[PDB]
Amino acid sequence: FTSKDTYLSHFNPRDYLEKYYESQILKHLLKNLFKIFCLGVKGDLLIDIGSGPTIYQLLSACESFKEIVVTDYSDQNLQELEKWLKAAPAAFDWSPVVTYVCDLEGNRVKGPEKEEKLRQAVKQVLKCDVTQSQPLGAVPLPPADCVLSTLCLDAACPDLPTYCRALRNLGSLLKPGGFLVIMDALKSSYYMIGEQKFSSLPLGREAVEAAVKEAGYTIEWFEVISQSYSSTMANNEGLFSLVARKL
Ligand SMILES: Nc1ncnc2c1ncn2[C@@H]1O[C@H](CSCC[C@H](N)C(=O)O)[C@@H](O)[C@H]1O
Ligand SMILES: CNc1cc(C)c(C(N)=O)c[n+]1C
């Protein structure tokens, strides 16, 4: 299984964004995140776990959370995030994704307004390791109202016991009754970024549900989509989305 130090050196954030941000999946993820945050889940603080170099998973969340903390294992990934946050020239063009979210939300606001709301919400950009009892290391944070994690845990966990432990580790960042939002690939053993291969833990819906209950959460809803990534990218059998609450 891919060692975590491989994410520091061999995960190219720009290439990842070019390759995936595939469109049918992105549309579905955006609809689900809009449903969760704008049509319910809210608070003062949301922690996004394994953010990578993406901002798409935060576009509807910034309407419901005063503060958003973005986290990842890779320093290169956080640097790419910060380029967009600081509106740098070499920052990735999220404008077609931003326009799509504005349409879903009833066309209340336009693209630049949406982007400014996200940039204002993101207060901290932090290093994280989901395999650690303290994922944020020595960095102190108030208990979060919500912990979000998109397409991370399958890639970060080498086996089912580590996956369950990672869910418990994420729980330590959550207030009692706090929400856990996870969206990830089903039965995927790898994913590609050009010629670079990355391992993935191939989990079915039953193993995901069991791990979440074992980790001390109650599931509110669980959705499975049949849509898989292109043959050239991965071997997944769809994706899942779940909303759970910490016991
Ligand atoms: N142990 C670990 N702890 C935290 N993040 C990890 C990790 N191992 C890998 N990652 C991160 O998991 C990410 C997978 S890519 C997912 C990126 C983004 N959330 C999206 O939805 O597209 C990478 O950014 C990688 O750096
Ligand atoms: C689009 N990003 C993806 C896609 C897939 C299919 C997997 C996986 N777990 O195989 C991981 N990431 C990060």
mmCIF file of C-alpha atoms and ligand atoms in Angstrom:
data_model
loop_
_atom_site.group_PDB
_atom_site.id
_atom_site.type_symbol
_atom_site.label_atom_id
_atom_site.label_comp_id
_atom_site.label_asym_id
_atom_site.label_seq_id
_atom_site.Cartn_x
_atom_site.Cartn_y
_atom_site.Cartn_z
ATOM 1 C CA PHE A 1 0.000 0.000 0.000
ATOM 2 C CA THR A 2 1.189 3.586 -0.888
ATOM 3 C CA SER A 3 3.288 4.945 2.025
ATOM 4 C CA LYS A 4 2.085 8.368 3.358
ATOM 5 C CA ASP A 5 5.466 10.007 2.517
ATOM 6 C CA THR A 6 4.561 9.313 -1.206
ATOM 7 C CA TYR A 7 1.778 11.978 -0.826
ATOM 8 C CA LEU A 8 4.391 14.559 0.201
ATOM 9 C CA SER A 9 6.592 14.078 -2.913
ATOM 10 C CA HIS A 10 4.667 12.243 -5.720
ATOM 11 C CA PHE A 11 1.120 13.659 -5.535
ATOM 12 C CA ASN A 12 1.167 16.490 -8.124
ATOM 13 C CA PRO A 13 -1.708 18.905 -7.089
ATOM 14 C CA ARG A 14 -1.867 20.744 -10.480
ATOM 15 C CA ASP A 15 -1.968 17.407 -12.403
ATOM 16 C CA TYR A 16 -4.652 16.059 -9.994
ATOM 17 C CA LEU A 17 -6.867 19.166 -10.618
ATOM 18 C CA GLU A 18 -6.312 18.907 -14.417
ATOM 19 C CA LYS A 19 -7.216 15.184 -14.495
ATOM 20 C CA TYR A 20 -10.312 15.223 -12.250
ATOM 21 C CA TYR A 21 -11.633 18.787 -11.761
ATOM 22 C CA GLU A 22 -15.137 12.645 -13.951
ATOM 23 C CA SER A 23 -17.591 15.571 -14.546
ATOM 24 C CA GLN A 24 -20.698 13.386 -13.878
ATOM 25 C CA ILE A 25 -19.185 12.425 -10.475
ATOM 26 C CA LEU A 26 -18.268 16.056 -9.630
ATOM 27 C CA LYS A 27 -21.882 17.166 -10.441
ATOM 28 C CA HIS A 28 -23.271 14.447 -8.141
ATOM 29 C CA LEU A 29 -20.863 15.366 -5.283
ATOM 30 C CA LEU A 30 -21.917 19.057 -5.606
ATOM 31 C CA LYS A 31 -25.691 18.194 -5.512
ATOM 32 C CA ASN A 32 -25.147 16.043 -2.362
ATOM 33 C CA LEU A 33 -23.068 18.718 -0.586
ATOM 34 C CA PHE A 34 -25.752 21.359 -1.466
ATOM 35 C CA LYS A 35 -28.467 19.022 -0.046
ATOM 36 C CA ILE A 36 -26.468 18.393 3.210
ATOM 37 C CA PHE A 37 -25.408 21.993 4.011
ATOM 38 C CA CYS A 38 -28.065 24.243 2.423
ATOM 39 C CA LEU A 39 -31.245 22.076 2.572
ATOM 40 C CA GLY A 40 -29.514 21.412 7.300
ATOM 41 C CA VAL A 41 -25.947 20.833 8.611
ATOM 42 C CA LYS A 42 -24.540 24.060 10.122
ATOM 43 C CA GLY A 43 -22.425 25.525 12.881
ATOM 44 C CA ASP A 44 -19.566 27.782 13.850
ATOM 45 C CA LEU A 45 -16.836 25.354 12.710
ATOM 46 C CA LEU A 46 -16.372 22.777 9.909
ATOM 47 C CA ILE A 47 -13.089 20.852 9.547
ATOM 48 C CA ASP A 48 -12.422 19.510 5.996
ATOM 49 C CA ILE A 49 -10.148 16.406 6.304
ATOM 50 C CA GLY A 50 -7.820 15.479 3.384
ATOM 51 C CA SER A 51 -8.817 18.578 1.376
ATOM 52 C CA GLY A 52 -5.959 17.985 -1.083
ATOM 53 C CA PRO A 53 -5.771 20.951 -3.520
ATOM 54 C CA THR A 54 -9.593 21.168 -3.976
ATOM 55 C CA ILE A 55 -12.236 23.749 -2.902
ATOM 56 C CA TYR A 56 -15.376 22.261 -4.598
ATOM 57 C CA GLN A 57 -16.378 20.391 -1.371
ATOM 58 C CA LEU A 58 -16.554 23.753 0.531
ATOM 59 C CA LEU A 59 -18.695 25.865 -1.872
ATOM 60 C CA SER A 60 -22.067 25.031 -0.215
ATOM 61 C CA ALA A 61 -20.497 24.611 3.301
ATOM 62 C CA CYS A 62 -19.378 28.309 3.416
ATOM 63 C CA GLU A 63 -23.107 29.280 3.408
ATOM 64 C CA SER A 64 -23.672 27.282 6.670
ATOM 65 C CA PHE A 65 -20.394 27.586 8.625
ATOM 66 C CA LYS A 66 -18.878 30.809 10.037
ATOM 67 C CA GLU A 67 -15.379 29.225 10.003
ATOM 68 C CA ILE A 68 -13.910 26.471 7.806
ATOM 69 C CA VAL A 69 -10.546 24.807 8.568
ATOM 70 C CA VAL A 70 -8.890 23.016 5.557
ATOM 71 C CA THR A 71 -6.452 20.151 6.256
ATOM 72 C CA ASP A 72 -4.199 17.680 4.397
ATOM 73 C CA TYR A 73 -1.150 15.457 4.830
ATOM 74 C CA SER A 74 0.662 17.081 1.847
ATOM 75 C CA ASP A 75 2.331 20.544 2.146
ATOM 76 C CA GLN A 76 2.329 20.828 -1.724
ATOM 77 C CA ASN A 77 -1.502 20.326 -1.673
ATOM 78 C CA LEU A 78 -2.002 23.055 0.981
ATOM 79 C CA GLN A 79 0.232 25.432 -1.081
ATOM 80 C CA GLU A 80 -2.047 24.891 -4.156
ATOM 81 C CA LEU A 81 -5.164 25.540 -1.922
ATOM 82 C CA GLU A 82 -3.581 28.774 -0.547
ATOM 83 C CA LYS A 83 -2.815 29.999 -4.133
ATOM 84 C CA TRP A 84 -6.614 29.940 -4.768
ATOM 85 C CA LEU A 85 -7.455 31.344 -1.265
ATOM 86 C CA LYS A 86 -5.046 34.327 -1.818
ATOM 87 C CA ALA A 87 -6.303 34.727 -5.476
ATOM 88 C CA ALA A 88 -2.822 34.088 -6.943
ATOM 89 C CA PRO A 89 -2.254 34.157 -10.777
ATOM 90 C CA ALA A 90 -1.156 30.461 -11.073
ATOM 91 C CA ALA A 91 -4.235 29.409 -8.962
ATOM 92 C CA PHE A 92 -6.615 26.830 -10.478
ATOM 93 C CA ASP A 93 -9.694 28.008 -12.430
ATOM 94 C CA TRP A 94 -12.734 26.857 -10.359
ATOM 95 C CA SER A 95 -15.130 29.315 -12.176
ATOM 96 C CA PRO A 96 -17.200 26.544 -14.055
ATOM 97 C CA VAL A 97 -17.626 24.622 -10.731
ATOM 98 C CA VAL A 98 -18.448 27.920 -8.861
ATOM 99 C CA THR A 99 -21.086 28.789 -11.570
ATOM 100 C CA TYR A 100 -22.611 25.279 -11.217
ATOM 101 C CA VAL A 101 -23.021 25.711 -7.387
ATOM 102 C CA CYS A 102 -24.561 29.233 -7.855
ATOM 103 C CA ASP A 103 -27.183 27.619 -10.221
ATOM 104 C CA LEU A 104 -28.035 24.804 -7.683
ATOM 105 C CA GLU A 105 -28.472 27.388 -4.830
ATOM 106 C CA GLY A 106 -31.257 29.252 -6.733
ATOM 107 C CA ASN A 107 -29.002 31.853 -8.501
ATOM 108 C CA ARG A 108 -29.142 34.082 -5.338
ATOM 109 C CA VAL A 109 -25.492 35.204 -5.902
ATOM 110 C CA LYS A 110 -22.966 35.360 -8.825
ATOM 111 C CA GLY A 111 -19.475 33.744 -9.124
ATOM 112 C CA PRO A 112 -17.235 36.476 -7.543
ATOM 113 C CA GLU A 113 -19.621 36.844 -4.512
ATOM 114 C CA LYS A 114 -19.606 33.020 -3.936
ATOM 115 C CA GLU A 115 -15.754 32.906 -4.109
ATOM 116 C CA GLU A 116 -15.402 35.859 -1.679
ATOM 117 C CA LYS A 117 -17.708 34.123 0.859
ATOM 118 C CA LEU A 118 -15.498 30.952 0.690
ATOM 119 C CA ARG A 119 -12.209 32.936 0.986
ATOM 120 C CA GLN A 120 -13.629 34.769 4.064
ATOM 121 C CA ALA A 121 -14.788 31.470 5.700
ATOM 122 C CA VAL A 122 -11.394 29.681 5.400
ATOM 123 C CA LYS A 123 -9.451 30.804 8.499
ATOM 124 C CA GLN A 124 -6.770 28.089 8.865
ATOM 125 C CA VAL A 125 -4.832 25.753 6.507
ATOM 126 C CA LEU A 126 -3.401 22.851 8.547
ATOM 127 C CA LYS A 127 -1.328 19.666 8.333
ATOM 128 C CA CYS A 128 -3.268 16.497 9.280
ATOM 129 C CA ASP A 129 -2.760 12.731 9.552
ATOM 130 C CA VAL A 130 -6.010 10.718 9.953
ATOM 131 C CA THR A 131 -4.008 7.664 11.169
ATOM 132 C CA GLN A 132 -2.920 9.596 14.317
ATOM 133 C CA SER A 133 -4.925 9.765 17.631
ATOM 134 C CA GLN A 134 -4.519 13.586 17.308
ATOM 135 C CA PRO A 135 -4.966 14.120 13.507
ATOM 136 C CA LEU A 136 -3.966 17.809 13.856
ATOM 137 C CA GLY A 137 -0.831 16.990 15.928
ATOM 138 C CA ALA A 138 -0.077 19.690 18.531
ATOM 139 C CA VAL A 139 -2.431 22.297 16.896
ATOM 140 C CA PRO A 140 -5.363 23.061 19.264
ATOM 141 C CA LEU A 141 -8.857 23.658 17.820
ATOM 142 C CA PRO A 142 -12.351 24.027 19.390
ATOM 143 C CA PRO A 143 -14.513 20.831 18.932
ATOM 144 C CA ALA A 144 -16.073 21.123 15.436
ATOM 145 C CA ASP A 145 -19.802 21.138 14.587
ATOM 146 C CA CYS A 146 -19.003 19.090 11.427
ATOM 147 C CA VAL A 147 -16.109 17.000 10.039
ATOM 148 C CA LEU A 148 -16.164 16.610 6.218
ATOM 149 C CA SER A 149 -13.971 14.208 4.202
ATOM 150 C CA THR A 150 -14.224 13.674 0.434
ATOM 151 C CA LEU A 151 -12.217 10.941 -1.438
ATOM 152 C CA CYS A 152 -9.556 10.753 1.355
ATOM 153 C CA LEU A 153 -10.077 7.866 3.806
ATOM 154 C CA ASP A 154 -9.949 5.047 1.147
ATOM 155 C CA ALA A 155 -6.554 6.448 0.003
ATOM 156 C CA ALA A 156 -5.206 7.125 3.545
ATOM 157 C CA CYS A 157 -6.061 3.757 5.206
ATOM 158 C CA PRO A 158 -4.110 0.555 4.295
ATOM 159 C CA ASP A 159 -6.620 -1.841 5.944
ATOM 160 C CA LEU A 160 -10.118 -2.076 7.524
ATOM 161 C CA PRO A 161 -8.835 -1.750 11.214
ATOM 162 C CA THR A 162 -6.902 1.489 10.304
ATOM 163 C CA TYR A 163 -10.059 2.786 8.491
ATOM 164 C CA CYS A 164 -12.177 2.242 11.643
ATOM 165 C CA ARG A 165 -9.404 3.817 13.798
ATOM 166 C CA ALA A 166 -9.244 6.830 11.373
ATOM 167 C CA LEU A 167 -13.031 7.374 11.864
ATOM 168 C CA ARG A 168 -12.462 7.318 15.680
ATOM 169 C CA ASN A 169 -9.490 9.747 15.251
ATOM 170 C CA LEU A 170 -11.766 12.118 13.239
ATOM 171 C CA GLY A 171 -14.382 11.803 16.028
ATOM 172 C CA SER A 172 -11.888 13.292 18.550
ATOM 173 C CA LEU A 173 -12.181 16.611 16.528
ATOM 174 C CA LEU A 174 -15.987 16.576 16.771
ATOM 175 C CA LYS A 175 -18.291 17.851 19.511
ATOM 176 C CA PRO A 176 -20.816 15.257 20.962
ATOM 177 C CA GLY A 177 -23.737 15.049 18.493
ATOM 178 C CA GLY A 178 -21.494 16.655 15.836
ATOM 179 C CA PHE A 179 -21.916 15.624 12.182
ATOM 180 C CA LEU A 180 -19.543 13.427 10.129
ATOM 181 C CA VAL A 181 -19.905 13.788 6.315
ATOM 182 C CA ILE A 182 -18.006 11.268 4.137
ATOM 183 C CA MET A 183 -18.059 10.775 0.332
ATOM 184 C CA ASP A 184 -15.659 8.226 -1.192
ATOM 185 C CA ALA A 185 -15.135 5.486 -3.787
ATOM 186 C CA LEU A 186 -16.606 1.999 -3.398
ATOM 187 C CA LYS A 187 -14.477 -1.147 -4.078
ATOM 188 C CA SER A 188 -11.508 0.826 -5.513
ATOM 189 C CA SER A 189 -7.994 -0.668 -5.066
ATOM 190 C CA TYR A 190 -6.164 2.172 -6.933
ATOM 191 C CA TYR A 191 -6.426 5.591 -8.613
ATOM 192 C CA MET A 192 -4.151 7.310 -11.134
ATOM 193 C CA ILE A 193 -2.725 10.823 -11.608
ATOM 194 C CA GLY A 194 -1.313 10.460 -15.132
ATOM 195 C CA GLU A 195 1.270 7.632 -14.957
ATOM 196 C CA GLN A 196 1.429 7.821 -11.116
ATOM 197 C CA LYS A 197 -0.469 5.046 -9.300
ATOM 198 C CA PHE A 198 -1.881 5.448 -5.747
ATOM 199 C CA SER A 199 -3.293 2.652 -3.576
ATOM 200 C CA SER A 200 -6.901 2.652 -2.319
ATOM 201 C CA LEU A 201 -8.638 0.424 0.261
ATOM 202 C CA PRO A 202 -11.367 -1.494 -1.659
ATOM 203 C CA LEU A 203 -14.409 -1.244 0.658
ATOM 204 C CA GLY A 204 -18.019 -2.171 -0.005
ATOM 205 C CA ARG A 205 -21.038 -0.315 1.436
ATOM 206 C CA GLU A 206 -21.494 -2.938 4.249
ATOM 207 C CA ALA A 207 -17.853 -2.515 5.505
ATOM 208 C CA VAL A 208 -18.186 1.328 5.401
ATOM 209 C CA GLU A 209 -21.473 1.214 7.427
ATOM 210 C CA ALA A 210 -20.012 -1.307 9.960
ATOM 211 C CA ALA A 211 -16.787 0.785 10.463
ATOM 212 C CA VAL A 212 -18.828 4.024 11.055
ATOM 213 C CA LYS A 213 -21.042 2.230 13.695
ATOM 214 C CA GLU A 214 -17.945 0.561 15.296
ATOM 215 C CA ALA A 215 -16.255 4.026 15.461
ATOM 216 C CA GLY A 216 -19.116 5.410 17.660
ATOM 217 C CA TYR A 217 -21.483 7.164 15.164
ATOM 218 C CA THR A 218 -25.165 6.770 14.140
ATOM 219 C CA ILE A 219 -25.901 6.928 10.388
ATOM 220 C CA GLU A 220 -28.589 9.485 9.322
ATOM 221 C CA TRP A 221 -28.514 8.507 5.590
ATOM 222 C CA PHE A 222 -26.391 6.472 3.155
ATOM 223 C CA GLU A 223 -26.422 6.827 -0.669
ATOM 224 C CA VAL A 224 -24.681 4.715 -3.299
ATOM 225 C CA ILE A 225 -24.281 5.859 -6.940
ATOM 226 C CA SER A 226 -23.361 3.340 -9.657
ATOM 227 C CA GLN A 227 -21.268 5.891 -11.680
ATOM 228 C CA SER A 228 -17.547 4.912 -11.771
ATOM 229 C CA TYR A 229 -14.474 6.990 -12.817
ATOM 230 C CA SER A 230 -13.055 6.551 -16.391
ATOM 231 C CA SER A 231 -11.206 3.215 -17.002
ATOM 232 C CA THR A 232 -7.892 5.137 -17.312
ATOM 233 C CA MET A 233 -8.227 6.607 -13.736
ATOM 234 C CA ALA A 234 -9.467 3.879 -11.329
ATOM 235 C CA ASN A 235 -11.249 0.501 -10.846
ATOM 236 C CA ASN A 236 -14.063 1.696 -8.500
ATOM 237 C CA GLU A 237 -17.610 0.317 -8.427
ATOM 238 C CA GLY A 238 -19.430 3.602 -7.761
ATOM 239 C CA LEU A 239 -19.250 5.994 -4.807
ATOM 240 C CA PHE A 240 -21.048 6.465 -1.493
ATOM 241 C CA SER A 241 -22.125 9.504 0.482
ATOM 242 C CA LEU A 242 -23.122 9.385 4.168
ATOM 243 C CA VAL A 243 -24.135 11.742 7.004
ATOM 244 C CA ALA A 244 -23.623 10.424 10.544
ATOM 245 C CA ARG A 245 -23.658 11.903 14.086
ATOM 246 C CA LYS A 246 -21.082 11.253 16.831
ATOM 247 C CA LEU A 247 -22.489 9.383 19.895
HETATM 248 N N1 LIG B 1 -2.858 9.940 6.434
HETATM 249 C C1 LIG B 1 -3.411 10.967 5.771
HETATM 250 N N2 LIG B 1 -3.994 11.957 6.483
HETATM 251 C C2 LIG B 1 -4.553 12.983 5.832
HETATM 252 N N3 LIG B 1 -4.646 13.187 4.514
HETATM 253 C C3 LIG B 1 -4.073 12.184 3.830
HETATM 254 C C4 LIG B 1 -3.448 11.067 4.362
HETATM 255 N N4 LIG B 1 -2.971 10.243 3.352
HETATM 256 C C5 LIG B 1 -3.314 10.870 2.252
HETATM 257 N N5 LIG B 1 -3.983 12.048 2.465
HETATM 258 C C6 LIG B 1 -4.510 12.968 1.459
HETATM 259 O O1 LIG B 1 -5.653 12.393 0.861
HETATM 260 C C7 LIG B 1 -5.909 13.133 -0.355
HETATM 261 C C8 LIG B 1 -6.536 12.250 -1.414
HETATM 262 S S1 LIG B 1 -7.120 13.270 -2.796
HETATM 263 C C9 LIG B 1 -8.719 13.907 -2.195
HETATM 264 C C10 LIG B 1 -8.641 15.414 -2.400
HETATM 265 C C11 LIG B 1 -10.005 16.122 -2.181
HETATM 266 N N6 LIG B 1 -10.567 16.007 -0.827
HETATM 267 C C12 LIG B 1 -11.104 15.663 -3.213
HETATM 268 O O2 LIG B 1 -12.246 15.401 -2.882
HETATM 269 O O3 LIG B 1 -10.659 15.614 -4.471
HETATM 270 C C13 LIG B 1 -4.576 13.790 -0.754
HETATM 271 O O4 LIG B 1 -4.639 15.206 -0.639
HETATM 272 C C14 LIG B 1 -3.581 13.253 0.283
HETATM 273 O O5 LIG B 1 -2.563 14.196 0.599
HETATM 274 C C1 LIG B 2 -10.717 11.776 -7.722
HETATM 275 N N1 LIG B 2 -9.928 11.419 -6.555
HETATM 276 C C2 LIG B 2 -9.945 10.046 -6.202
HETATM 277 C C3 LIG B 2 -10.627 9.064 -6.930
HETATM 278 C C4 LIG B 2 -10.600 7.725 -6.524
HETATM 279 C C5 LIG B 2 -11.362 6.756 -7.363
HETATM 280 C C6 LIG B 2 -9.901 7.384 -5.348
HETATM 281 C C7 LIG B 2 -9.826 5.994 -4.815
HETATM 282 N N2 LIG B 2 -10.030 5.881 -3.457
HETATM 283 O O1 LIG B 2 -9.557 5.056 -5.551
HETATM 284 C C8 LIG B 2 -9.223 8.392 -4.648
HETATM 285 N N3 LIG B 2 -9.248 9.666 -5.101
HETATM 286 C C9 LIG B 2 -8.535 10.681 -4.351
#
